[PDB]
Symmetry: C3
Subunit: 63 residues, 3 copies
């Protein structure tokens, strides 16, 4: 992966160190979760106004 | 959930922000784990005196 | 476990506290992951020279 190697290799020395792999992995886990949480958020917030009022939170219960 | 919305909404402005959801989730994950760990602890500690001596720890091995 | 109780019991008072269990668990989770990551690393790095060049990273893709 052209682009991908360049992302993980932060100092740009053409090599991917351990700290680098360990960092990318960490970074990736983070984003993945952020992304999932927001998807759930923007979801509950029906009127996408950025907040969840008692009603939306209320309409968010199937059992 | 009456009580529940009030817990997640910390500043009490009637709304639940993203930071708020993200926080509650975090808080919840924490407690869940604490609770599980302790259940395992209080378990091994047969004489519930708050400590696990070599014997209890010893009697805690099925294979 | 002879050796094991002594590892978890850090202050060496013959007892294993909660903080102690909670710590060992944490410590263990850490090592386990470090170990796995490295196994993946040393793996990709075919010439075990400590770095992963564009080629190895390149030869590391089955689909
Ligand atoms: Sr590098
Ligand atoms: Sr809304
Ligand atoms: Sr709020
Ligand atoms: Sr005990
Ligand atoms: Sr102790
Ligand atoms: Sr190499």
């Amino acid at each position: 992966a052209e682009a991908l190697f360049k992302e993980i290799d932060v100092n740009g020395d053409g090599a991917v160190s351990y700290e680098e792999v360990k960092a990318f992995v960490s970074k990736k886990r983070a984003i993945k979760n952020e992304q999932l949480l927001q998807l759930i958020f923007k979801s509950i917030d029906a009127d996408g106004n950025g907040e969840i009022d008692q009603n939306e939170f209320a309409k968010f219960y199937g059992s």
